[PDB]
Design an enzyme around this catalytic site. Structure first.
Site, PDB file in Angstrom:
ATOM      1  N   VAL A  22     126.134  25.315  37.046  1.00 25.09           N
ATOM      2  CA  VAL A  22     126.481  23.653  37.327  1.00 25.09           C
ATOM      3  C   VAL A  22     127.361  22.555  36.559  1.00 25.09           C
ATOM      4  CG1 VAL A  22     126.460  21.514  39.559  1.00 25.09           C
ATOM      5  CG2 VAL A  22     125.177  23.843  39.695  1.00 25.09           C
ATOM      6  N   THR A  74     130.414  18.009  26.734  1.00 26.89           N
ATOM      7  CA  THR A  74     131.991  18.275  26.442  1.00 26.89           C
ATOM      8  C   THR A  74     132.489  16.328  26.629  1.00 26.89           C
ATOM      9  OG1 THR A  74     132.577  19.109  28.158  1.00 26.89           O
ATOM     10  CG2 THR A  74     131.517  20.658  26.187  1.00 26.89           C
ATOM     11  N   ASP A 121     139.415  35.838  26.542  1.00 27.66           N
ATOM     12  CA  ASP A 121     139.733  35.587  28.411  1.00 27.66           C
ATOM     13  C   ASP A 121     140.424  34.041  28.088  1.00 27.66           C
ATOM     14  OD1 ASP A 121     140.125  35.950  31.546  1.00 27.66           O
ATOM     15  OD2 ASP A 121     137.936  34.824  31.058  1.00 27.66           O
TER      16      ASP A 121
HETATM   17  C1  LIG Z   1     130.927  20.852  30.218  1.00 28.94           C
HETATM   18  C2  LIG Z   1     131.375  22.328  29.339  1.00 28.94           C
HETATM   19  C3  LIG Z   1     129.869  23.148  28.738  1.00 28.94           C
HETATM   20  C4  LIG Z   1     130.406  23.925  27.735  1.00 28.94           C
HETATM   21  C5  LIG Z   1     132.587  24.256  28.275  1.00 28.94           C
HETATM   22  N1  LIG Z   1     132.858  25.196  27.244  1.00 28.94           N
HETATM   23  C6  LIG Z   1     134.246  25.883  26.848  1.00 28.94           C
HETATM   24  O1  LIG Z   1     135.074  24.303  26.571  1.00 28.94           O
HETATM   25  C7  LIG Z   1     134.681  26.274  25.955  1.00 28.94           C
HETATM   26  C8  LIG Z   1     135.304  25.916  24.886  1.00 28.94           C
HETATM   27  C9  LIG Z   1     135.744  27.578  23.749  1.00 28.94           C
HETATM   28  C10 LIG Z   1     135.023  27.981  23.375  1.00 28.94           C
HETATM   29  C11 LIG Z   1     135.395  29.315  22.324  1.00 28.94           C
HETATM   30  C12 LIG Z   1     137.227  29.428  22.036  1.00 28.94           C
HETATM   31  C13 LIG Z   1     137.317  28.441  22.059  1.00 28.94           C
HETATM   32  C14 LIG Z   1     136.930  27.200  23.537  1.00 28.94           C
HETATM   33  C15 LIG Z   1     133.061  23.476  28.280  1.00 28.94           C
HETATM   34  C16 LIG Z   1     132.698  22.941  29.610  1.00 28.94           C
HETATM   35  C17 LIG Z   1     134.177  22.263  30.540  1.00 28.94           C
HETATM   36  O2  LIG Z   1     133.866  22.964  31.493  1.00 28.94           O
HETATM   37  N2  LIG Z   1     134.006  21.018  30.396  1.00 28.94           N
HETATM   38  C18 LIG Z   1     134.637  20.129  31.276  1.00 28.94           C
HETATM   39  C19 LIG Z   1     135.741  18.866  30.772  1.00 28.94           C
HETATM   40  N3  LIG Z   1     136.282  18.187  31.176  1.00 28.94           N
HETATM   41  C20 LIG Z   1     136.401  18.991  32.727  1.00 28.94           C
HETATM   42  N4  LIG Z   1     137.818  17.655  33.449  1.00 28.94           N
HETATM   43  C21 LIG Z   1     137.672  18.888  34.966  1.00 28.94           C
HETATM   44  C22 LIG Z   1     137.737  19.224  36.182  1.00 28.94           C
HETATM   45  C23 LIG Z   1     138.458  17.442  36.367  1.00 28.94           C
HETATM   46  C24 LIG Z   1     138.621  17.146  37.458  1.00 28.94           C
HETATM   47  C25 LIG Z   1     139.179  17.961  38.552  1.00 28.94           C
HETATM   48  C26 LIG Z   1     138.494  19.454  38.429  1.00 28.94           C
HETATM   49  C27 LIG Z   1     137.999  19.674  36.859  1.00 28.94           C
HETATM   50  N5  LIG Z   1     135.945  20.023  34.785  1.00 28.94           N
HETATM   51  C28 LIG Z   1     136.052  19.961  33.010  1.00 28.94           C
HETATM   52  C29 LIG Z   1     134.751  19.984  32.379  1.00 28.94           C
END
Ligand SMILES: Cc1ccc(NC(=O)/C=C/c2ccccc2)cc1C(=O)Nc1cnc2[nH]c(-c3ccccc3)nc2c1
Length: 240
Positions: A22, A74, A121
């Site tokens: 989540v 993040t 991906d």
């Molecule tokens: C929390 C978290 C942890 C880890 C990762 N992993 C990587 O990013 C991988 C990188 C990577 C790895 C390897 C290579 C390249 C890249 C991602 C996330 C993550 O979802 N962050 C996020 C940020 N801003 C957001 N805004 C919205 C939103 C706003 C408005 C509406 C809907 C949604 N959802 C969001 C979600």
């Protein structure tokens, strides 16, 4: 211990749910907007992220590992997923900015390429967009895969290149599904036959040449992200 990456959960203020582990929106020490991901394979992502840092890659801020459930934190991307942005937020960007979105992703991928790291991906669904409209790369996808992946599971830098071309196509089609009238099975057959995605109406012939070059039958004949970046810049200078 994860050193300077360890975040005190007390410094977090949860506000809204973003997606279902989540992911939630909140603030870190009441100052910084963050996204928080709730749950050894889960912590594997963080370890990868602790070693990668670039302006166009979603940035890790830290981790909470001393408490169940474990959090990954993040930077917060205000405009959400690129795919939805392309479909739902067209009132916020003009045709010239489509190439800028491609450049953002290409810069991230050139960085990954130099680190010999494979995304595996790459697609619009796996990119996020911030408040300024800057695109960042985040995290079977048949429609984004080259023939050698579909036939032999041959992953390489050149399979990311193929996927990038498809992403460019997604951007210029404003978030259409690639091979929109075909199933995954039909797509694979057609790709193996040398069929390629058509030129989106918004893509100039020079822009289409860039995406098309990503789809050469021979992997070794596909460009690198360094080459793609120079091509995108050249077109940007000519069309702007
Ligand atoms: C929390 C978290 C942890 C880890 C990762 N992993 C990587 O990013 C991988 C990188 C990577 C790895 C390897 C290579 C390249 C890249 C991602 C996330 C993550 O979802 N962050 C996020 C940020 N801003 C957001 N805004 C919205 C939103 C706003 C408005 C509406 C809907 C949604 N959802 C969001 C979600």
């Amino acid at each position: 211990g994860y050193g300077s990456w360890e975040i005190d959960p007390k410094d977090l203020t949860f506000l809204k749910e973003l997606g279902t582990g989540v992911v939630k929106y909140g603030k870190w020490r009441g100052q910084y907007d963050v996204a928080i991901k709730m749950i050894d394979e889960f912590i594997e992502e963080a370890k990868v992220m602790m070693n990668l840092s670039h302006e166009k890659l979603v940035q890790l801020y830290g981790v909470c590992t001393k408490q169940r459930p474990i959090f990954i934190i993040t930077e917060y991307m205000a405009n959400g997923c690129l795919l939805n942005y392309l479909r739902e937020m067209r009132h916020r960007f003009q045709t010239q900015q489509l190439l800028e979105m491609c450049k953002d992703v290409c810069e991230a991928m050139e960085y990954l390429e130099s680190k010999q790291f494979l995304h595996r991906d790459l697609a619009a669904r796996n990119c996020l967009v911030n408040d300024q409209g800057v695109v960042k790369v985040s995290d079977f996808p048949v429609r984004w895969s080259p023939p050698e992946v579909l036939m032999y599971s041959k992953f390489s830098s050149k399979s990311d290149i193929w996927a990038f071309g498809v992403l460019m196509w997604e951007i210029y089609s404003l978030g259409k599904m690639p091979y929109e009238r075909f199933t995954n099975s039909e797509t694979a057959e057609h790709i193996a036959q040398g069929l390629r995605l058509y030129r989106p109406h918004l893509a100039s012939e020079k822009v289409y040449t860039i995406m098309y070059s990503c789809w050469h039958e021979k992997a070794d004949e596909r460009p690198t992200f360094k080459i793609l970046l120079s091509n995108i810049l050249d077109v940007m200078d000519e069309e702007s």
